[PDB]
Every structure is written in C-alpha cells, then in structure tokens.
Design a protein around this ligand. Structure first.
Ligand SMILES: [Fe+3]
Length: 818
C-alpha cells in the first residue's frame, strides 16, 4: 500500500464526518494504460483517519491518512480522481504520497459528487509542454481543458468551473428604468472593449442585448477566493458599500442631519481628526459589517473617523503647492500620463469643424521657464505636458449638459527645472464651440499666481486638471489598463493551457482574485448608477469613455520601456543598463519601475528556456498556439485587426508576451492602485468631479472667489456626500489583505517538481529583495528629495516589492487582486 496524506479545509474555515464513506480518491497511472491508451484507474479509496502528527499545518487545515492498493500492473501515479459524498463542499489543499514522494497541489473546492458532470481530476506537480505529456495522461489532459471551456451556453452556477467570454452588456439595468440603459461595450466598432467572464444569466425582458440582473455575478469557482479572516475579503466591501452603506449615508443627508456641503477646508480635514457626526442608526449600520467596520474609527454612537491620508501626515497644506501638483505627475497615484512636448504651441488632432478652432491660446512669452527661451527649453528636452485636451474634448459638451457636472478639456505645460524638479507653467481650460451654442462660457489660459483672486483662479485651474486626471486615472490607467485588459488573458489561460503547462504555472499566480474583483466591480462599481458613475465627473458616460480610450490601447506599448519612449519621457539608449535613458532623471515611478521590469524580465528569460530550447518548440506547442490565438481573436477580439500583436512563433515573442502580462498584473497595477487613498484621501488633492465652470466677472460667484476662496473651491469640486462614498471605496482598494501573495512569492512551495524552475524562482525573489534595498537608499538620498518625497514629505514606496498588511503605500502583489 501507498501511504497518503490528504490536506483539506472544511467550508466553515466535525472532522469525523469526513471518515467512513464520505470522501473517495482513486489514483490514476501515468505509465500503465488501458486498451485505449488512458492511464489505468485504481479502486475507490476512502479517508481512513485524522492525522494529528505533523506540527506543520496552516490555519484551518486538517490532514487525513489514506492507503492505496497499487500493484505492479499499475505503474506510477500521475493524477487522481476525487468524489465528495458529503452534502457540503470542502476545500482540497493537497495529496502527498510517500516512499514512491509524489506531490499534488490542488487548492480547489470539491462539491458533492452529484453536482458534477464529470469526476474531479487533479495532476501531480510535474510540468509538461504538450509533446512531453506522458502518453497515458494525454487524453485526461485534453478532456480537462474541454471541461473548463464548456459549450458557450447555460446559466453558470456557483460550483461551475467554466471559463468563457462575453461583452460588457451587464452594466445597464433597463428593466428597472430606461435611464439605466447603457450601451453594450465590446463587439462593435463604435464601442470596442476587452471581453469579460461569461455568466449566462440571459436577457432582460426589455432588451435582448443586455444581461438580466443577478444577486451573485458568477466567476469560475476557484476564482472566488475564500479568506480565513473576514477582514481580508476586501472585494466584498465594494458590494456592502453600494448596497448597505451608501443608502445609510444618503439618509443622513435627506434628513438634514449633517450639513449638505463642506463649508471650509477644515470641514474636510475634520474627517480624519475629530471625525464626522452621523445619526446613530447610520453608525449602527456600519459597525457590524466585515471590511466596512475596518474603514473608520468610531465611538459606537455617532462618530466616524477616516484614517489620516499619507499626503497630509507631515504637512496638511503641501498638496496646494505647485511643486506637489507637478511632482504627483511623476510620483503620484497616476504617474504615467505626462508626455514630452517637442514643439510649441501644442497641437490638436481634433476636427475644428466640430469643436471650433483648436489652436492653443498659450503664448510662449507668457511662460516662466527659469530664464530659458522656448527654443532652448524644447531643444534641451525640458518641456513636458499633461495633455487631456484631445481625450476630453469629445465628451465635454455632453458632460456639461448634466445638471451637476461641468468640466474643461485641460492641458498643463510643465518645465523641468535645472534642479531636476518639474514646475507647472500654464494651464489651458478648453471648451468646445459650435455655432448654435447656448452657453457663453469661453476657453481660457491660466498662469501661476500666489496672491489675490488670480491665485484662487490658478488653484481652481489645477482642480479642473486633477478632475480630468482622476477620471483618466480611475477609468483608464487603472480600470481599463489593468483590471479590464487582464481578464481576457485569465480566461484564455484556463481554457487552453493545462494546469500541467509551464506557461500556466508561470502566469496564473498573476491572476489571483482578478476575475472575482472584476465581477464584483461589474455588479457594484461600474454598473448603471453605481459607485463610479455617482462619484466621477462623466457620470453615465464614464465606462463608455473607457471604450473610446481602448480604441488606442496597444498591447506592446504596455511594456514599460515602450511606454516611456512613446510618451517622450525617455529615449532608446543601448549604452544604458535598461536600454533607455530617462529625460527626467529622478522620475520615481519610471526609475523604480525599470528595476522591477528588469527583474521580471530576467525571471521570464531564465524560466522559458527550461521548457523551450528553440523557436520551433514555441511554434509547435499546440496549447500555447491555441491560447494566444484565442486571447487575441476572442478576448481582445475588437482589436484583432491591429498589426502590432506579437505572433508567438519565437522564444523572444513568448518572453515578451509573458513579461508584459506579468508587468501589467503586478507592478503596473500596484503603482496605480495603492496610492489611491494615500494621495486621494484628501478630496482637495484628488477631486473626482467638478460642478461649475470659472465664474464671470461681476457675479456673486466671482466675488466669492475673492472673499471665500475655500468655499469657491469646495463648490467646484466633488460634493460632500459623494466624497464620503468615494473616500470609503478608495480606502478599501488601497488596503493589502493579510493573505496577499506578493511578487517573488507563490502560494505553495511545491508548485512544480522541477528543481531548475524552483531555483530560478528563488533567484528572482532574492533579486527583488536587493532591489528594495536600492529603493530604500534612493528614498534616503537627500539629493532626490524633491521628486521622491516632495513638500508632502512622502517617500515614494509604491514600488517597494514587499509590504505588511493594511494601507501601507508599498508592496507589489502578484496580481490585480483589489
Ligand atoms: Fe485595482
């Protein structure tokens, strides 16, 4: 008999109930086949007893002894079937067979046997490209992929493990109201979009093209991550905020229990000092809710107190400095949009027949470039911009028609000073113009000012820019480029790469929780009248704006060197270690990012050749070829006609594709995600909406800018009630769960039996530790203070690879996990 140990976790996170005839396992041979060439299968073997011997056992886990009859005619086990005859599902961790050691890493929920169309199968931890699969496992390997793909029909159930694609046709709620109808995103030239995971709930009764509402948005079962500690279930907080907390806040405002608007900046600071007083029944709603109860300190009676945002921990006024406004474009929440400006004035590609004359109104001789002429600044590569003009202009008219929204399409010009810091030198606030226009508001240029009403107008100009930047950050840099862009690759990977496949093992840690958070976001974040639409400027146009931006999304430009070169913030330079020379030498995001990028590249370049010796080996891997074909032609199918997709016929193409996927999922998402509350937890620093244009001279609103500048500012930016909701959301999303798995870590040390792959992975984790030491030295270097810390004195730690749990402003998860 072969001695085995099963480790599992009961659903409650009673052990005698697993004995008797409750759980059967059957070993499957990798070497002895039946007459059809399929590995022979052993007898049903039941769990025999509880193993209390090994002190090495994670929380919630139990170990069971089992002995398998396995004679000569059976060969070597390479897989097993398991049947759960119990009513309730359990979480299967592993099987370990001794003195034959063979390890099986399972980490999968096993529901009652009657719920499955075919018996659950698990493979030992060996790694095989398809031409290396032992012959008696070839059919089992392919049948398991066929099972995962399903047939493209049916309402998906909680226990299903079926991966497939669908369009974003589940955000509208047209059965509730015509006002809640939304365009389908994906599957048309008007609205191209990445695909998402298919749920199959079926059509609404009013629109056959929109998917009906559902209490639970399915994800394949093992994508729905359980947590030992309920506080770690951060993705569910989004749902609780929308469904329970937001209505409670709304009630406090409807009943006039708290002022409707902030009246001074101190009313905003109060949120993390003394707190806000709210009705008792409002506090009583929050206090018992998992995740939500961690967001606020409370007296249990009437007070909620938000945590002090990092950006104010040293100076509560530094966010208002021009130095910090520009520094955040290279070391802030959204450090990836600034571009070099190589001509002046800046140009627009938009049609003047639609929007009016698009010539810039910024004059060169009005700009203070520290004594440089414009030609000198351009030539020395010292001029940059944050350009939202062409991005926002197409939507300004329809946004400004909404009752409580008004924006400009902004452009900010920045100068790289000789001291190496950026300074803002002008903001252009543009509006579309057409013959029939009812509005008399005009475009204007605003220049820096420190005194008088001109200083208030300049501070407001910065707020209009940061509203554009916050909307672009959240919808494009963050949602579109990480969450949404990655999901098609998750789906393709499970559909086409076996668990046995080396590239499955390389990529899947980088998908942890991504389908789950995305489904929860379709339900409560980006749904019609959901949190994003009611907190961000574009309202009901928000998600469709991300579709318009996706028209220009380029997979190969997500690589960090290509991004930097495309934006004109670095140049190709083969004499440099990273192959690019930064044009802003101390650009903290890019400088730290290049280190992480290089480490991932080395890991991928070391792992790939362990499994692929020539370009032909890549061409000849049928799972890999099917995977990439489907990811492109189905998952990102609206961009299938584009010439820039890698072909995947060479080793270098495989490395490139894997490298870009891991970068997007880990460091890029971390850099755009974990600064959300640290920088945006002060709404004045990261306003999410603007509600009025600049006032005309001779009006009470203009006199208010002179006499009460803080009120003028607060009336312009996000109102108090959506601010309380936005702050709560971003606090959740900026938190690391205690069970996170970070870059350089895996959830199990035995993910492969291949020692060379294990060694290469250890080298990768060591290199990340080395890199963190280097980044600490950078933050401690007084010469780099201006960009790495700024007047907010906030060291740039967002690309430190490691972190403890909580709202830490550091740490790079493997995946898009929140
Ligand atoms: Fe995120």
């Amino acid at each position: 008999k072969i001695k085995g140990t099963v480790v599992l976790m009961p659903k409650n996170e009673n052990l005698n109930a697993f004995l008797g005839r409750s759980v059967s396992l059957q070993l499957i041979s990798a070497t002895k086949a039946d007459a059809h060439g399929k590995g022979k299968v052993g007898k049903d073997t039941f769990l025999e007893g509880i193993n209390t011997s090994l002190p090495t056992l994670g929380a919630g886990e139990s170990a069971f002894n089992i002995h398998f009859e396995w004679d000569g005619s059976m060969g070597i086990p390479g897989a097993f079937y398991i049947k759960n005859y119990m009513q309730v599902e359990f979480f299967l961790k592993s099987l370990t067979l001794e003195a034959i050691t063979i390890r099986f890493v399972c980490n999968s929920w096993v529901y009652n046997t009657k719920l499955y169309k075919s018996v659950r199968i698990f493979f030992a931890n060996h790694t095989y490209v398809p031409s290396e699969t032992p012959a008696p496992l070839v059919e089992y390997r392919e049948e398991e992929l066929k099972s995962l793909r399903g047939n493209g029909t049916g309402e998906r159930k909680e226990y299903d493990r079926i991966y497939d694609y669908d369009v974003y046709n589940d955000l509208g709620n047209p059965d509730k109201s015509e006002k809640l109808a939304r365009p389908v995103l994906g599957g048309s030239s008007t609205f191209p979009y990445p695909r998402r995971g298919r749920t199959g709930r079926g059509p609404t009764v009013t629109d056959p093209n929109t998917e009906k509402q559902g209490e639970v948005f399915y994800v394949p079962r093992d994508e729905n991550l359980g947590h030992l500690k309920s506080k770690d279930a951060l993705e569910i907080g989004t749902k609780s905020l929308s469904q329970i907390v937001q209505p409670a806040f709304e009630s406090a405002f409807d009943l006039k229990s708290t002022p409707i608007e902030f009246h001074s900046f101190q009313d905003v600071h109060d949120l993390y000092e003394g707190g806000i007083k709210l009705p008792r029944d409002v506090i009583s709603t929050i206090i018992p809710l998992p995740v939500i109860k961690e967001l606020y300190r409370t007296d249990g009676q009437h007070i909620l107190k938000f945590p002090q945002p990092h950006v104010v921990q040293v100076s509560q006024s530094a966010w208002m400095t021009d130095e910090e406004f520009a520094r955040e474009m290279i070391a802030g929440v959204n450090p990836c949009v600034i571009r070099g400006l190589e001509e002046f004035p800046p140009k627009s590609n938009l049609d003047p027949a639609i929007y009016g004359d698009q010539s810039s109104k910024i004059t060169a001789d009005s700009l203070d470039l520290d004594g440089y002429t414009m030609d000198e600044a351009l030539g020395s590569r010292r001029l940059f911009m944050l350009d939202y003009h062409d991005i926002f202009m197409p939507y300004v008219r329809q946004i400004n028609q909404l009752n409580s929204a008004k924006t400009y399409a902004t452009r900010t010009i920045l100068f790289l000073r000789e001291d190496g810091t950026l300074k803002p030198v002008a903001i252009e606030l543009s509006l579309p113009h057409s013959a029939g226009d009812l509005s008399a508001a005009v475009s204007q240029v605003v220049l820096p000012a420190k005194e008088g009403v001109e200083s208030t107008i300049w501070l407001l100009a910065k707020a209009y820019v940061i509203v554009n930047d916050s909307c672009y950050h959240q919808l494009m840099s963050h949602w579109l480029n990480t969450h949404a862009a990655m999901e098609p690759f998750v789906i393709a990977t499970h559909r086409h790469l076996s668990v046995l496949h080396p590239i499955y093992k390389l990529l899947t840690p980088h998908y942890r929780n991504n389908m789950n958070i995305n489904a929860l976001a379709r339900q409560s974040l980006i749904n019609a009248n959901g949190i994003a639409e009611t907190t961000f400027l574009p309202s009901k146009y928000s998600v469709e704006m991300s579709s318009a931006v996706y028209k220009n999304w380029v997979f190969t430009d997500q690589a960090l060197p290509a991004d930097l070169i495309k934006r004109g913030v670095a140049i190709k330079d083969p004499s440099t270690p990273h192959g690019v020379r930064l044009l802003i030498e101390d650009y903290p995001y890019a400088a730290d990012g290049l280190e992480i990028w290089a480490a991932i590249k080395t890991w991928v370049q070391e792992y790939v050749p362990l499994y692929y010796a020539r370009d032909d080996d890549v061409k000849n891997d049928s799972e890999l070829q099917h995977w990439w074909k489907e990811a492109v032609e189905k998952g990102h199918g609206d961009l299938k006609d584009k010439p820039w997709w890698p072909k995947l016929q060479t080793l270098e193409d495989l490395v490139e594709v894997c490298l870009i996927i891991i970068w997007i999922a880990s460091a890029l998402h971390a850099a755009v995600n974990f600064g959300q509350y640290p920088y945006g937890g002060l709404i004045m620093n990261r306003p999410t909406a603007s509600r009025r244009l600049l006032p005309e001279k001779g009006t009470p609103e203009y006199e208010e800018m002179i006499n009460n500048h803080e009120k003028a500012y607060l009336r312009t930016i996000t109102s108090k009630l959506p601010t309380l909701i936005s702050l709560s959301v971003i606090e959740i999303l900026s938190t690391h769960a205690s069970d996170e798995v970070y870059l350089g870590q895996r959830d199990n040390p035995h993910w492969t039996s291949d020692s060379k792959a294990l060694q290469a992975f250890q080298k990768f984790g060591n290199k990340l530790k080395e890199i963190e030491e280097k980044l600490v030295r950078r933050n401690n270097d007084p010469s780099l203070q201006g960009n790495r810390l700024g007047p907010v004195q906030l060291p740039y730690t967002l690309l430190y690879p490691s972190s403890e749990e909580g709202l830490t402003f550091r740490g790079i998860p493997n995946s898009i996990s929140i």
